[PDB]
Write a protein that binds this DNA or RNA. Structure first.
Ligand code: MG
Ligand code: MG
Ligand code: ZN
Ligand code: ZN
Ligand code: ZN
Ligand code: ZN
Lengths: 162, 162
DNA sequence: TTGACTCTCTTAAGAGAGTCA
DNA sequence: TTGACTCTCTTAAGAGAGTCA
């Protein structure tokens, strides 16, 4: 809600509820041939999810609280960042999973950044493979690698140069 | 169905037309602090675009040819790949700009790959900065770098471990 | 046969809001 | 007030198809 006190109360209630979500250990590539371990706090697969939480999409949830007799509702991963600017360079700030695990609500696995920055982590080589993200990745992106390109650049004639 | 000879004729007419597009020299980052040069063959900003070409969206075009009284139409960047498989690993193949310049139709600046592979090139460090794409990038991706993350991982209490 | 427009759709990283009990 | 559902939207890398002369 509007007051700083009320927003802190929202963040604190959220953390306490998510803190009781099952803690699931995931071993992850870090880049550089190394492996690490993340502890994700995973929202349940089906109702009930936890006080204040409801599913609005297969991998989408919202957190809701009643404040001043009014319902206030947020995307379930946005709550840690309610005191942060909601835009950057004219781009919307998004909740971004460093663990690349949608069900996880561990705020130690979340950052707040443009959708482009968010997406780009999918291909990051990782914290031991060359990550240059200023807010560092926790793991190599799941899509990092050589790709599976079917056909490369080519011409039949002689009209083009690189 | 069009014979492979008819398909080659389509590719050849496309190349002949695109080859006459304005050729624009662009200096680009390669990664590793190095700079290179790409020569993009850029479709005009407004009609007329070239024989066979029409705009279906702000940065979308199509190529159309009529053969034996049947109108055939393709996405304007897909024509170089008409003799290639159109999917891989159960994913549709997409035209992917190695120069990251949508108006460019130089086939030496295009490859044919999944949309995920395509997107990921936006963040690639580039051919002199650590690119691991098997079909190598021509330049560092425009979105490579430290990012502009507004807030990193954080908690107010002690409910969480990383 | 051709040009110049029109419309909606896909994907996978993210969102907001309404209907009932 | 709280829970459990429903629906459509945003973005930026890509698509197919219709109308008219
Ligand atoms: Mg993400
Ligand atoms: Mg691309
Ligand atoms: Zn996690
Ligand atoms: Zn990174
Ligand atoms: Zn180009
Ligand atoms: Zn690359």
């Amino acid at each position: 809600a509007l007051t700083n006190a009320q927003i802190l109360a929202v963040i604190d209630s959220w953390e306490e509820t998510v803190g009781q979500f099952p803690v699931i250990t995931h071993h992850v590539p870090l880049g550089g041939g190394l492996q690490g371990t993340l502890h994700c706090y995973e929202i349940p697969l089906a109702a009930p999810y936890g006080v204040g939480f409801a599913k609005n999409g297969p991998t989408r949830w919202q957190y809701k609280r009643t404040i001043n007799q009014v319902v206030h509702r947020w995307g379930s991963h946005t709550v840690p960042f309610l005191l942060e600017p909601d835009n950057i360079n004219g781009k919307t700030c998004t909740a971004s999973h460093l663990c690349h695990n949608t069900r996880c609500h561990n705020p130690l696995h979340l950052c707040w950044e443009s959708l482009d920055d968010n997406k780009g982590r999918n291909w990051c080589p990782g914290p031991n493979g060359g990550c240059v993200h200023a807010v560092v990745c926790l793991r190599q992106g799941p899509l990092y690698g050589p790709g599976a390109t079917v056909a490369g650049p080519q011409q039949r004639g002689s009209h083009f140069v690189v």
